[PDB]
Design an enzyme around this catalytic site. Sequence first.
Site, PDB file in Angstrom:
ATOM      1  N   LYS A  10     -26.960 -12.343  -2.745  1.00 37.42           N
ATOM      2  CA  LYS A  10     -27.874 -11.183  -2.878  1.00 37.42           C
ATOM      3  C   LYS A  10     -27.301 -10.120  -1.987  1.00 37.42           C
ATOM      4  O   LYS A  10     -27.476 -10.153  -0.790  1.00 37.42           O
ATOM      5  CB  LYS A  10     -29.294 -11.518  -2.403  1.00 37.42           C
ATOM      6  CG  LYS A  10     -30.303 -10.333  -2.602  1.00 37.42           C
ATOM      7  CD  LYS A  10     -31.725 -10.859  -2.446  1.00 37.42           C
ATOM      8  CE  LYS A  10     -32.744  -9.825  -2.948  1.00 37.42           C
ATOM      9  NZ  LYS A  10     -32.545  -8.573  -2.172  1.00 37.42           N
TER      10      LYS A  10
ATOM     11  N   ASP B 143       0.826  -1.171   0.000  1.00 40.74           N
ATOM     12  CA  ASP B 143       0.000   0.000   0.000  1.00 40.74           C
ATOM     13  C   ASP B 143       0.875   1.239   0.000  1.00 40.74           C
ATOM     14  O   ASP B 143       0.510   2.280  -0.640  1.00 40.74           O
ATOM     15  CB  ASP B 143      -0.900   0.024   1.252  1.00 40.74           C
ATOM     16  CG  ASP B 143      -1.919  -1.128   1.270  1.00 40.74           C
ATOM     17  OD1 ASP B 143      -2.052  -1.913   0.273  1.00 40.74           O
ATOM     18  OD2 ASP B 143      -2.565  -1.232   2.314  1.00 40.74           O
TER      19      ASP B 143
ATOM     20  N   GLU C 282       3.768   1.666  -1.335  1.00 45.14           N
ATOM     21  CA  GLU C 282       4.306   1.998  -2.675  1.00 45.14           C
ATOM     22  C   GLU C 282       3.241   2.596  -3.592  1.00 45.14           C
ATOM     23  O   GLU C 282       3.528   3.498  -4.379  1.00 45.14           O
ATOM     24  CB  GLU C 282       4.944   0.820  -3.340  1.00 45.14           C
ATOM     25  CG  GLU C 282       5.228   0.916  -4.839  1.00 45.14           C
ATOM     26  CD  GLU C 282       6.462   1.729  -5.103  1.00 45.14           C
ATOM     27  OE1 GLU C 282       7.130   2.107  -4.109  1.00 45.14           O
ATOM     28  OE2 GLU C 282       6.749   2.024  -6.276  1.00 45.14           O
TER      29      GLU C 282
ATOM     30  N   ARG D 252     -31.015   3.251  -8.445  1.00 47.08           N
ATOM     31  CA  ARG D 252     -32.163   2.644  -9.050  1.00 47.08           C
ATOM     32  C   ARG D 252     -33.446   3.523  -8.957  1.00 47.08           C
ATOM     33  O   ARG D 252     -34.241   3.574  -9.946  1.00 47.08           O
ATOM     34  CB  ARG D 252     -32.426   1.330  -8.415  1.00 47.08           C
ATOM     35  CG  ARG D 252     -33.613   0.617  -9.028  1.00 47.08           C
ATOM     36  CD  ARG D 252     -33.848  -0.719  -8.380  1.00 47.08           C
ATOM     37  NE  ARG D 252     -34.909  -1.411  -9.093  1.00 47.08           N
ATOM     38  CZ  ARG D 252     -36.197  -1.331  -8.763  1.00 47.08           C
ATOM     39  NH1 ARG D 252     -36.570  -0.573  -7.745  1.00 47.08           N
ATOM     40  NH2 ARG D 252     -37.104  -1.948  -9.500  1.00 47.08           N
TER      41      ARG D 252
ATOM     42  N   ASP E 200       0.806   4.394  -2.552  1.00 47.77           N
ATOM     43  CA  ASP E 200       0.611   5.764  -2.114  1.00 47.77           C
ATOM     44  C   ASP E 200       1.761   6.691  -2.502  1.00 47.77           C
ATOM     45  O   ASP E 200       1.534   7.853  -2.911  1.00 47.77           O
ATOM     46  CB  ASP E 200       0.333   5.880  -0.599  1.00 47.77           C
ATOM     47  CG  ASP E 200       0.065   7.305  -0.232  1.00 47.77           C
ATOM     48  OD1 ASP E 200      -1.051   7.819  -0.579  1.00 47.77           O
ATOM     49  OD2 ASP E 200       1.001   7.966   0.248  1.00 47.77           O
TER      50      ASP E 200
HETATM   51  C1  LIG Z   1     -33.130  -7.981 -13.260  1.00 51.80           C
HETATM   52  C2  LIG Z   1     -32.338  -8.479 -12.056  1.00 51.80           C
HETATM   53  C3  LIG Z   1     -32.074  -7.314 -11.108  1.00 51.80           C
HETATM   54  C4  LIG Z   1     -30.655  -7.300 -10.572  1.00 51.80           C
HETATM   55  S1  LIG Z   1     -29.921  -8.920 -10.536  1.00 51.80           S
HETATM   56  C5  LIG Z   1     -29.365  -8.886  -8.965  1.00 51.80           C
HETATM   57  N1  LIG Z   1     -28.339  -9.717  -8.713  1.00 51.80           N
HETATM   58  C6  LIG Z   1     -27.804  -9.792  -7.528  1.00 51.80           C
HETATM   59  N2  LIG Z   1     -26.783 -10.702  -7.346  1.00 51.80           N
HETATM   60  C7  LIG Z   1     -28.308  -8.970  -6.556  1.00 51.80           C
HETATM   61  N3  LIG Z   1     -27.977  -8.838  -5.263  1.00 51.80           N
HETATM   62  C8  LIG Z   1     -28.765  -7.885  -4.769  1.00 51.80           C
HETATM   63  N4  LIG Z   1     -29.617  -7.417  -5.704  1.00 51.80           N
HETATM   64  C9  LIG Z   1     -30.623  -6.370  -5.385  1.00 51.80           C
HETATM   65  O1  LIG Z   1     -31.924  -6.969  -5.478  1.00 51.80           O
HETATM   66  C10 LIG Z   1     -32.844  -5.977  -6.018  1.00 51.80           C
HETATM   67  C11 LIG Z   1     -33.996  -6.754  -6.613  1.00 51.80           C
HETATM   68  O2  LIG Z   1     -34.599  -7.342  -5.433  1.00 51.80           O
HETATM   69  C12 LIG Z   1     -32.023  -5.275  -7.033  1.00 51.80           C
HETATM   70  O3  LIG Z   1     -32.521  -3.986  -7.294  1.00 51.80           O
HETATM   71  C13 LIG Z   1     -30.626  -5.251  -6.384  1.00 51.80           C
HETATM   72  O4  LIG Z   1     -30.531  -4.086  -5.599  1.00 51.80           O
HETATM   73  C14 LIG Z   1     -29.373  -8.090  -6.834  1.00 51.80           C
HETATM   74  N5  LIG Z   1     -29.879  -8.068  -8.066  1.00 51.80           N
HETATM   75  C1  LIG Z   2      -2.102   4.590   2.449  1.00 52.27           C
HETATM   76  C2  LIG Z   2      -2.913   3.547   1.713  1.00 52.27           C
HETATM   77  C3  LIG Z   2      -2.811   3.459   0.317  1.00 52.27           C
HETATM   78  C4  LIG Z   2      -3.541   2.499  -0.416  1.00 52.27           C
HETATM   79  C5  LIG Z   2      -4.341   1.622   0.294  1.00 52.27           C
HETATM   80  C6  LIG Z   2      -5.152   0.597  -0.460  1.00 52.27           C
HETATM   81  N1  LIG Z   2      -4.712   0.361  -1.809  1.00 52.27           N
HETATM   82  C7  LIG Z   2      -3.598  -0.394  -2.030  1.00 52.27           C
HETATM   83  C8  LIG Z   2      -3.172  -0.593  -3.310  1.00 52.27           C
HETATM   84  C9  LIG Z   2      -1.975  -1.410  -3.550  1.00 52.27           C
HETATM   85  N2  LIG Z   2      -1.724  -1.487  -4.807  1.00 52.27           N
HETATM   86  O1  LIG Z   2      -1.280  -2.058  -2.698  1.00 52.27           O
HETATM   87  C10 LIG Z   2      -3.871   0.006  -4.422  1.00 52.27           C
HETATM   88  C11 LIG Z   2      -4.982   0.821  -4.143  1.00 52.27           C
HETATM   89  C12 LIG Z   2      -5.393   0.969  -2.810  1.00 52.27           C
HETATM   90  O2  LIG Z   2      -6.416   1.703  -2.494  1.00 52.27           O
HETATM   91  C13 LIG Z   2      -4.461   1.719   1.687  1.00 52.27           C
HETATM   92  C14 LIG Z   2      -5.352   0.755   2.515  1.00 52.27           C
HETATM   93  C15 LIG Z   2      -3.756   2.683   2.420  1.00 52.27           C
END
Ligand SMILES: CCCCSc1nc(N)c2ncn([C@@H]3O[C@H](CO)[C@@H](O)[C@H]3O)c2n1
Ligand SMILES: Cc1ccc(Cn2cc(C(N)=O)ccc2=O)c(C)c1
Length: 318
Positions: free
Chosen positions: A116, A32, A34, A137, A36
């Site tokens: 989900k 991290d 590097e 949405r 940063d």
């Molecule tokens: C047409 C299908 C719609 C999206 S598919 C899908 N995949 C998943 N793996 C999901 N995990 C959570 N959600 C939520 O559930 C709502 C529908 O209850 C959606 O508005 C999403 O906010 C997912 N939805």
């Molecule tokens: C200070 C600092 C810098 C970056 C991160 C997290 N992280 C790491 C990398 C990395 N390539 O290793 C890339 C993007 C990123 O968001 C943290 C937790 C703290």
Amino acid sequence: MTNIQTQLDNLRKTLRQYEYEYHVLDNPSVPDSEYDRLFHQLKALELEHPEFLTSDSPTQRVGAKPLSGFSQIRHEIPMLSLDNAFSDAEFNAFVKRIEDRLILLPKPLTFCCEPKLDGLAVSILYVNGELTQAATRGDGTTGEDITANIRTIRNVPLQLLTDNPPARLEVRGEVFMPHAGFERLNKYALEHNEKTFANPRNAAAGSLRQLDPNITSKRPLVLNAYGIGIAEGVDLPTTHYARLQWLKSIGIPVNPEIRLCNGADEVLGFYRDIQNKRSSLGYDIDGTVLKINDIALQNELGFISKAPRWAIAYKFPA
Ligand SMILES: CCCCSc1nc(N)c2ncn([C@@H]3O[C@H](CO)[C@@H](O)[C@H]3O)c2n1
Ligand SMILES: Cc1ccc(Cn2cc(C(N)=O)ccc2=O)c(C)c1
């Protein structure tokens, strides 16, 4: 050509690659610190040569100015909901129904089985690879413009990682808050007399209604992508799992618990396994989304009023 522009281009490319390894692959190739050191090298150099600052540079996720409100966005394609099931017999009835409706029932009926996620549904548009707008949405037809807030999320790329991005690509996913971030947030908000949150779902929703992207930036939000809206100028794979692998391969975070499963019994084993792991995922899920994997089969099944007939959310009991 100038040395500064080459330095900037090279830092940007290196840093987007590291963000992809850290956030999407969960396999960073550098520490991290590097990451940063190069991040704040880029940021200083940009500030010292502002004419080369680009809006999608890795240093530009956070707007300096609180927004005055959110505009509405009617989705080009509506965001549907999901029918739900609450038991193995009810899941099995949903499958027999598909089995009967289908003109030709394939040898394995393959589902793409997903956790989900329990957060907020969003839609994120990339134009020629560049993130240009994001919406909630809302009601499925109209949502709100949260572009500035979505830009803050660390695992959302500002540009797709591919030299041939589609003309337009709209990524659909859940924005949610892992448990560790949720617990640090409520500890912080108590020690500073701000709104504590009841559960990670509510923390994510409230973090995304922040008008000041500087506050959203301090909220530990993550995207997982589970679908695609608009997709112009690309040939999308013809299975849903393959589309998710393609999103991942171009820079988009996707949940690693997703599996293909053949037939209802295998799907049920996925459900039981997920339900077991639930305790130790480091984030909240509501149950599973089971989707017919083949896109032609999904198009054949279509929609009922406004959920797919090709997917169902099998929820966990209380
Ligand atoms: C047409 C299908 C719609 C999206 S598919 C899908 N995949 C998943 N793996 C999901 N995990 C959570 N959600 C939520 O559930 C709502 C529908 O209850 C959606 O508005 C999403 O906010 C997912 N939805
Ligand atoms: C200070 C600092 C810098 C970056 C991160 C997290 N992280 C790491 C990398 C990395 N390539 O290793 C890339 C993007 C990123 O968001 C943290 C937790 C703290």
